[PDB]
Structure formats: C-alpha cells, structure tokens
C-alpha cells in the first residue's frame, strides 16, 4: 500500500532554471529582453571596470560581461552563492555607474530589475545578509538619486516650460527610483518569507536609519510626491509591522527601534490618509497633498504590480536604438505622450483605495503591536481615522451612491474596516484615550457611529423584490462582474443546485445594501452601538442620547 518512488527523479538544475529565467527575463512593455538590452549597452567614461574577475572594457557589451559572469559562476557555485555573487557584483556595477558625473545611468534600471528577478526567484535559498547588503545598497542608492523625489511643489512664475521637452533622463531615473523602491519591497517580502527565528542577522540600526531617511524622502511634504514609491514605502512598513507581530522576539526589534522612527512615520501616514481620491483629476496635475494623482510623466507598471496603463511601455523599448551599441539614450520627446475611457481613472482609483486600506491596515497592525500604550498609541487614531470615516461616509452619501463606478464597494469597505479600527481602539485601548482628544473629535465620532445606528431601522429592504431593482440602479457593475465570473472563471458557478444562488440572492443584496449605505451588517451596527451606548466615556448623556434616538424614531 506504499506508493512506489521514482527511480529517475529528474530534479531540474535549479540554477539552470534561474539562469534561463534571467536570460529570458523581459519587463512588461519593452520589446527586447532585459539581458539583450544590456547587450545593447556600453559605458564610454569608465574605461575599465573590474571588481572580482568581472572585467568590463570601455566599449564592451555590458550584458555580455554579465553573461560571462553568469555562465562562469553557473559551473562553480551552488544556488545561494550564485545569487549573492550576482547581487554584490551587479551592486558594485550599479554603484560606480552611479558615482560618476559625466556617466549616463541607462543600464541602472535594467540592472535593478535584473537584480530584483535575481532576488525574488528563490527566496528559500536567498541569504539574509545578502538581503541586508543589497538593501542598504538600495537605500543609499536612493539617497544618491536624491533630487528625483525632491522636485518642489510649484514652479516659479518664470520657471519656463520652454525646454527641449526631453524625457529620456527623466525616464531613466524615474525607473531607477521606482524599481529601487520596488526592490526594497521585494527584499522585505523575501525576508518575510525567511523564517521567524532569522531576522537579527538582517536587522540592525543602519537598516532603520537608512529607511527612515528614504521614507521621509518618499512620503514627502514640501515636494511633489511619487504615488508609485508611496505604495512601496508603505508596503515596506506593512512588512515590518507584520513580522514584528509574527515573531516571538519582538522585544529586540522594538528595542532597536527608537520611538522617533514611529512618530515620524505616523505623521506622514496621517497626511497621506487625509488625501482625496477623485477620478476626474487623477491624471490632471493639480493642488498637492490632497490628490494622490499618479503623474502622467511617470506612468508605467512597476516590478510587483501593474499600477497604470504602462503608456511608457514602448518608450522603454525606444530608449535604445536596438541596432547599435550605445550608452547615451535614444530620444523620447516628452509631450508626444497623450479621451477614450476613464476606466483607467477608475482602476487607478481602485489602486488608491487599496492603498488607503493598507494605511488603515498598518494602523490596525501597529495597534496590535502596542496593545500597551506608548508615544504613538496616543489617541490621534481616534482623530484622523474618525475624520476619514466621517468624510468617506458623508460624501459617500452625497456623491457616490448612484455614480456606478466599480470603486464604490471598496470605498465603502474602507469605512467598514476603519469602523473596527475605531472600535477595538475604543474598547481595548481606552486607557490612553485622553479627555481632551475625544472632545477634539466629539462631533464626528458620535455622528459616524450614528450613521450605523440609523441603519437598525430596516425600512428599505425587507424583501427580495425591490432590492434587485436597486441593484439594477446602482449595482449593475457587480452584476456584470458576477455574470463574467459565473460564465467563465469559477468551477462552482455552473449547474446551480438551488441552494447556492440562494446564497447569491442573499449576498448580492446585502452587498448592494452596504453600497446603498442603509442596512449594514448587524455586527458592525453593534460595534457602533457599543461605543456610543457604552459608559466608558460620556459621549452623550441620557438626555442627549434620546435626541439621537428620535432621529430614527425609537
């Protein structure tokens, strides 16, 4: 009854698979593979490079030197030694390509994306000290590429837009910055995949200091923000707080952490969360720090997620002449880019709603870190989260219910989740919640609770019949979604046995009610009830609470 083994198990050579994946690695949008674009590269200022038998001549094909290193170290090293050999060698390559005044850095984005593909292929064998070395290299690499995330808010009155309208250097260093932060995110997720005993090798003070500088560089205040790198920079902090939660020896990590790092992160998180998401001025350039707007001149996918349309895709291919060995960039006139469909705006809104979800998610995570009170568990997550909850309910009701965009459901899931972020902060963390700050938010908290307490009346739904008319009114988009899923992409969605479309005509209807802002879930109504009704704080008196009960009836 024992299953018989395979006598000729062909375990594939994992470094051969890794090498082949390197060689055929191509980013999404460009014509040629990344290695081949590197073959189309030289460097006519560094007339010789060598670090460890990694000789690059003056007019040498750079990717040819790469593949020399690749094929050489393939015969020699095992997997992790091959990896970190490539990591440190291409790191030193990126290093002295960077630190030179006259040198163009066109190889650098492809080198960073190449190195990302190197890292993320097998995280099981990728070594954490190599992660640390590469990580600190990307951190001080971004403080080298310094002036990108520090373009000022407004131009001068005489800051002329007369210009050669060039885009090649801008494309180079936008890809450098974006791929760099993407690589930081990749390092930390593969370091997350490394086990829950093995972090102190990665973590020391220099990790936190370098990331603290580049984090203030990323979530900027007096400069134009790059929404791309904002995604990465907050996903980093997500991975950080996640592994702090999921290790046993969180004490060494939090003792390494100074609370200045916390309270400098949390202010930029608040200033991020107090921004707005409006489709009609995403791809417009507008007032700063209110509109996460994803500028037209940096619009591609990225290494992890495919964040935009990648209008710059063929422009990555036209960065090079593809019939020639060069280092200077091929031309991109800047304004040739650029009315068909604002679905681009809707999916960019979908990304930004997932972003604010991640912001309140890491708020949740850090509260679960500091179950105890601290400098940062201090009450401002009543204020800022309550402001967010109140605004994304009020102008939800004013603006969104009946706007039939696909983003309505996630935008009203934001309030559904930050209700619990209010709730467990209220119940389990009342000890720090100061008497002054609750009065700083006394209107909006109680009103936001009452916007769920008004939903216990239940005089809209009461049936099945008219509710599906209402979801024809507002939720035809999810009807399209579920017909496409039921028709193509789900095994269980065919030949429905008259118990599961029963579940459908329960859940689509409660979902479209949750869109229509009446008839939330009773547990969320109870969570809003057991803060306002709760006598932990005098939110209302009894002679003021009935003034709100009459505003339902009751």
């Amino acid at each position: 009854n024992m299953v018989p083994l395979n006598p000729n198990r062909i375990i594939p050579d994992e470094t051969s698979l890794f090498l082949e994946s390197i060689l055929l690695h191509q980013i999404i949008g460009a014509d040629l593979s990344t290695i081949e674009i590197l073959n189309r590269l030289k460097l006519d200022y560094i007339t010789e490079f060598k670090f460890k038998n990694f000789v690059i001549a003056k007019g040498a094909p750079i990717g040819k030197s790469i593949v020399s290193l690749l094929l050489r170290c393939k015969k020699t090293l095992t997997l992790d030694r091959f990896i970190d050999t490539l990591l440190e060698d291409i790191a030193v390559l990126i290093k002295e390509i960077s630190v030179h005044p006259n040198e163009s850095k066109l190889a650098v984005p492809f080198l960073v994306a190449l190195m990302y593909q190197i890292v993320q292929f097998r995280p099981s064998a990728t070594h954490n000290l190599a992660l640390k070395d590469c990580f600190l290299f990307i951190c001080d690499l971004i403080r080298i590429y310094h002036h990108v995330l520090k373009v000022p808010i407004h131009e001068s009155n005489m800051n002329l837009h007369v210009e050669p309208q060039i885009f090649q250097y801008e494309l180079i260093d936008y890809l450098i910055i974006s791929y760099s932060f993407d690589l930081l995110e990749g390092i930390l997720r593969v370091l997350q995949s490394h086990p829950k005993q093995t972090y102190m090798e990665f973590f020391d003070e220099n990790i936190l200091k370098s990331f603290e500088f580049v984090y203030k560089l990323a979530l900027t205040i007096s400069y134009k923000p790059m929404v791309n790198v904002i995604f990465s920079a907050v996903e980093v902090v997500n991975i950080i707080t996640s592994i702090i939660l999921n290790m046993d020896n969180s004490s060494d990590l939090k003792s390494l952490i100074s609370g200045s790092w916390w309270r400098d992160c949390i202010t930029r998180l608040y200033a991020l969360l107090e921004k707005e998401i409006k489709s009609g001025d995403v791809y417009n350039e507008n007032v700063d720090t209110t509109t996460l707007h994803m500028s037209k001149y940096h619009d591609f996918f990225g290494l992890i997620r495919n964040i935009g349309d990648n209008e710059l895709g063929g422009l990555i291919s036209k960065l090079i002449y593809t019939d020639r060995l060069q280092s200077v960039p091929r031309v991109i006139s800047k304004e040739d880019i650029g009315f068909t469909a604002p679905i681009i705006g809707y999916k960019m809104e979908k990304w930004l709603l997932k972003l604010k979800d991640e912001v309140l998610n890491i708020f949740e995570n850090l509260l679960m870190i500091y179950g105890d009170d601290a400098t940062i568990v201090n009450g401002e997550m009543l204020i800022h989260s309550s402001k967010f909850l109140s605004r994304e309910q009020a102008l939800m009701i004013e603006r969104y219910v009946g706007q039939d965009s696909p983003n309505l459901d996630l935008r009203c899931h934001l309030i559904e989740h930050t209700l619990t972020i209010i709730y467990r902060l209220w119940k389990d963390h009342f000890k720090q919640l100061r008497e002054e700050q609750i009065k700083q938010v006394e209107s909006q908290l109680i009103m936001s609770l009452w916007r769920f307490l008004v939903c216990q009346t239940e005089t809209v739904t009461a049936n099945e019949r008219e509710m599906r008319d209402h979801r024809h009114l507002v939720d035809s988009l999810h009807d399209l979604t579920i017909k496409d899923q039921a028709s193509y992409y789900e095994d269980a969605f065919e030949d429905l046995p008259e118990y599961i479309e029963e579940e459908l005509k329960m859940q689509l209807n409660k979902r479209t009610g949750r869109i229509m802002q009446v008839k939330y879930d009773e547990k969320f109504q109870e969570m809003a009830r057991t803060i306002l009704e709760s006598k932990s704080f005098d939110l209302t008196t009894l002679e003021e609470a009935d003034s709100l009960y009459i505003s339902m009836g009751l």
């Binding site: 299953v3 996640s242 008219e466 024809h472």
Partner: protein, 615 residues
C-alpha cells in the same frame, strides 16, 4: 427528509433565543448558553454516510450553524479550556467534513465562504488575544501537513493516509487561495493587500514542494489522476481571483510573477505527462481561462514565453494533441488562436459557418475541433471557446448602457441603433405600451436607461460621440475635487425646454395618478433619473404662483418626508440642482423657495437629510 422538519424547528429555536427584541448580536459572554449542546449536535449529526450526499438538506444543516454563529459571536471566543478557544477545534472538524466532500466545488465554496464570514468579522471583536490564537493554528496544521508531505519521499507512507494528507493539504491551500473579500485581514499572512501577501511566496514554495513530491512519487492510479487535476484547478483559481475583475473587459492581473508561476507550473505539469483522465475538462478550463486572461494584453507574450505549445503538434493525425481528448481540443483552439493572431489577417478569412476568421487551413483536414463545439453540457467550456473564437472578430465593443438595453430589449441593434431618435422611439413606445402593472422591475430598468440616455442627449453639443464610445458619464460618473457644483453649468439646457426624454418623463412619470404608490424601487429610480436630468439640465420653474409645484418639487416633498432613510438621503441630493439656473434662479427666487421649504421640517428623522440639504 425526516429531520428536515427538525432543522426547520431548529432554526426557529435559534431565532427564539435572539433577544427580548429584534436587536441581537450579543457579543459578550452572558452569565442561557443552552445552545451549546445543539452546537455540538450540528457537527455530531454531520460525519455520517447516508444523506450528506443530498445537497440542500446538508446546506441548511451547515447554514443553521452559520446563522447561530452569525447571531452569536461569543461562541468562538468561549474559551474551550483545553489550551485555546474552541475555534481551533472548530477548524479541523470542519476540515473533516470538507475532506469528505473534497470534490464538489459547490460544497467546498459554500463552506469556505461561510468560514470566511466566521473568521473575518467575528475575530474583530477581540483581535490580539484570539487573532494570533487562530492565525498561528492555521499555520500549525499547515506545517503539520507539509511536514507529513515529506515522508512520502522515503516510501514508508500509507495509501489512504497518503490520500487524505494530500487532500487536506489541498483544502488548506484552497481556503487561503480565496479572494480578499472572503478572508480579509483576519489571518496574519493575508494581512497585506495590493495582491501581494505573505501567502504568495510561501505558496510558491509549497507548490514547488508538491511538484517535487509528484516527481518523487510514481503512481498511475485513476484516483491519483483525479486528485492530480485538482491542484492545477487550484493553481488557476489562485491566479484568477487576484485579478482586478472589471465590468466586461478581461480581468487584468496584478502580479506578472504570479502569472509566470502558474504558467510555468502547469507547463511543467503537462511536460511530465501529468494529470490524464477521461471526460475531464479541468485542465482545458485552466488553459482557456489563462489564455482568456492573455488574449491580447501585454501578457500575451508572457503567455507564449511561460507556456509554449508549438512542440506537441502532430498535424497528420486525428489524434492531434496527445493527452486527453477534450483538453487537447482546447489546446488546439488556443494554438489556433495564437496562430490566428500571429499570421496576418489576409491569410485569414471568416467562413460565416461560425462567422470566425480562419486561415488557409491544411492539405489534410486537421480542423474539426477548431470551430465546432465539443461538449457534454460543458456550458462554461463552450462559452470560453466561443469567447476565444469571437474576441478576434473586432466587433462592436462591450458597453454598459448597450449591454443593459440588449438585456432589456433583446436584439435592438439589428438597425442603425447609434442613431439617436430611434432608441427614444423604442423607449417611448415601451413607456407608453408594454406595461400594465407587472413591470415594477422592468419600468425601473427603463427609467435607469432613461437616466443614462438623458446624459447621452446632454453629450451632444458638448458632434463627435456615438452609442458605443460612452461607458459612463464624464460629468456625473467621474468626479473631481472641491465643490462639485462649480462643474455644473448655469446655462445648461432646460429639461422641458429641450430634452424630449424629459418630456417623456413628465408625460408618464410626473403625470401618473399613482405617484403615491409606485414602489420604493420605482420612486428610487425616478429619483435617480431626475437627478441625472437636473444635473445635466436646467430644471423648470418650481412655482408660478397658482400653487403649482412642478410635479418634481412635488416629488421632493413626497420622498423627503418618506419613511425610509434611503429615499430621504436621495431626495436631498436633487435639491441643489434646483438652487442653480439662469432664467429660473437668476434673481434668487427658487433660492428663497428652497429656503422657506427647508425652514418647515421639525420632523425628527428628517433632521439628517435636512442638515445635509442645508449644507
């Protein structure tokens, strides 16, 4: 059968211990808790051989337990004092029934989504003393199953224990391969959003581990082929649900690495002659779904890279592709479509038998499964295949309002269609004729079509547009920041002055003798339509002086003091549309009209939309 009446009395017994009133969630432990024995009986009358094969009486059996846990969140967190809460004992017992019903996709999806309800929102009452007491336990039994996965290499493994070890591994995969809506942030590896979780890389580890196990084992059992198709079903289901899943366009992915993972995974699956079983469309479904994801986007080159097909051709046989007949047919169709878009279209031609483009075929036939349906009630399969055939045709693009009018009035666009006045004629003759009293749904569909069509009428003079190139509204459906009421136009056209769709609206709706009972649905829909018309259009004079509220301000009064809060908060939204016009509100008389209207509501429940209406 005999105990379906017991379940019908049992749900009544659950709803009996609700509360003194209809308000019941009761999150805390009260010092009758007599439903604990029934909670025990819900699963002790479940592990049985006779009528669990029946669908709906099993569905109600687990659904009564779902409603019990729905109305009682304290039941998970009751501290079953062995070492934990009872929810860890709940999960593996739940897993025993799921592994007894491992194969029925309905039976496992229906279980996993209700477990997602049981975990996502129920732990949120407690969090840290219980969230880490169950998200550790998931990875504990995961670690146990992947640990037991390794001793099948050394060959001393059993046969049925081998089987349900693989199956329990499979179901633990399947729960965590779900979407973000089922499992939210309740579980600590799915904590990260943006399609990018800790489950990603750990899953890419464990799938390579079970590939290594499948290369380690050597078994040609029929049931092994059956459970072998399951994991490729899971690997395509893992990558399908993390797509953005838009309206009618193909659902765009988020992680090209996860794409390459599933592509190279099923490719390495097929390379080793894995997963062959009779009359089984599962691999065909996976191939067709992933090709449907990679029809014509940027990831089509990624598809031809990380799943190549060119090398299994064998053109000169009836057995064209080797493995299993219908899956090989699907592969032939994918190969045909790839060849179709590779070749220039001049070689292609559409034969008008199935109206799809096809090249200059072959000296032999070799083209029998290319265009024919091949199914035994394989409905999703032939619809996949017909989408693959049809998407190349460069036909009329999918559009929201056009899909809705094709859903409502089928086969309308056998005409000009994009000509404007004829769809006005069709909607007018429908709103004059095709209703007596049964279309309390269909007339709501008609008026939401009228609400979008009035926007389309406003989109002329904005001499470029058409029926097809209008998904949503550039004024009502997209939005900018700041004051939205600056974007609206003072000297926009009038509703009754120019828009014959509003003439139709005033004809039927604003002059119907039973406005006081349409329905809440039809009142909501006429409010939406009037909202869009007065957004895109100037409303008429609200009052001349002879009483005379203009049948829409009358509707404001009717829906404003309404019993439900939704129509209150919708009827407040159309109010500032009255507050702006030229040649109506030029000298602030509709202003003072709305002012003295808003000064006249001391009703307690209308305070909310009252204050909002003020603002």
């Amino acid at each position: 059968e005999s105990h379906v009446k017991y379940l019908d009395e049992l749900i009544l017994a659950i709803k009996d211990l609700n509360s003194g009133v209809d308000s019941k969630v009761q999150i805390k432990k009260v010092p009758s808790l007599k439903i604990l024995n029934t909670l025990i009986r819900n699963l002790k009358d479940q592990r049985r051989n006779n009528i669990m094969k029946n669908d709906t009486i099993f569905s109600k059996t687990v659904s009564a337990l779902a409603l019990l846990l729905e109305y009682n969140p304290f039941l998970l967190v009751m501290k079953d004092s062995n070492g934990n809460f009872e929810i860890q004992r709940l999960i593996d017992d739940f897993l025993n029934i799921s592994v007894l019903n491992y194969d029925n996709y309905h039976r496992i999806w229906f279980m996993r989504r209700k477990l997602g309800s049981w975990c996502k929102a129920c732990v949120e009452f407690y969090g840290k003393p219980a969230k880490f007491q169950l998200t550790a336990h998931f990875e504990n039994t995961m670690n146990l199953y992947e640990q037991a996965l390794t001793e099948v290499l050394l060959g001393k493994t059993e046969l049925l224990k081998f089987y349900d070890t693989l199956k329990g591994l499979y179901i633990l995969l399947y729960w965590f391969t779900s979407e973000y809506s089922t499992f939210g942030n309740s579980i600590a590896f799915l904590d990260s959003s943006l399609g990018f979780t800790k489950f990603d890389f750990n899953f890419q580890r464990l799938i390579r581990i079970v590939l290594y196990v499948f290369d380690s084992c050597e078994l040609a059992a029929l049931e092994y082929a059956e459970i072998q198709l399951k994991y490729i079903s899971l690997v395509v289901d893992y990558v399908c649900n993390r797509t953005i899943s838009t309206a009618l366009d193909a659902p765009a992915l988020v992680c090209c690495e996860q794409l390459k993972f599933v592509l190279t995974t099923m490719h390495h699956f097929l390379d080793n002659k894995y997963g062959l079983l009779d009359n089984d469309p599962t691999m065909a479904k996976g191939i067709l779904r992933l090709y449907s994801l990679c029809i014509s986007n940027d990831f089509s080159k990624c598809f031809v890279d990380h799943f190549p097909i060119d090398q299994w051709a064998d053109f000169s046989q009836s057995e064209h592709f080797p493995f299993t007949q219908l899956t090989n047919k699907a592969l032939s169709i994918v190969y045909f479509d790839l060849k179709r878009r590779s070749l220039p279209v001049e070689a292609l031609k559409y034969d008008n038998k199935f109206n799809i483009w096809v090249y200059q075929s072959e000296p032999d036939s070799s083209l029998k499964n290319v265009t024919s349906p091949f199914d035994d009630r394989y409905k999703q399969l032939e619809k996949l295949r017909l989408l693959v055939l049809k998407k190349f045709n460069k036909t009329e693009r999918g559009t929201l309002l056009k899909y809705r009018v094709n859903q409502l009035s089928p086969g309308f666009f056998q005409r000009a269609g994009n000509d404007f006045k004829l769809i006005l004629n069709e909607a007018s003759v429908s709103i004059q004729t095709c209703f007596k009293t049964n279309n309390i749904t269909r007339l709501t569909s008609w008026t939401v079509i009228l609400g979008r069509l009035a926007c389309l009428e406003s989109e002329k003079f904005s001499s470029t547009k058409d029926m097809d190139n209008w998904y949503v509204c550039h004024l009502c459906d997209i939005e900018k920041t700041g004051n939205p009421f600056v974007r609206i136009n003072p000297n926009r056209p009038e509703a009754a002055g120019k828009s014959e769709i509003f003439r139709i609206l005033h004809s039927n709706f604003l002059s119907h003798p039973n406005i006081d009972e349409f329905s809440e649905s039809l009142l909501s829909g006429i409010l939406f339509s009037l909202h869009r018309i007065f957004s895109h259009f100037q409303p008429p004079k609200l009052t001349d002086g002879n009483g005379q509220i203009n049948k829409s301000f009358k509707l404001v009064q009717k829906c404003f003091m309404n019993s439900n809060r939704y129509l209150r908060l919708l009827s407040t939204r159309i109010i500032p549309l009255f507050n702006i016009s030229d040649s109506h509100n030029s000298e602030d008389e509709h202003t003072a009209t709305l002012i003295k209207f808003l000064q006249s509501q001391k009703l307690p429940v209308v305070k909310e939309n009252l204050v909002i209406a003020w603002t």
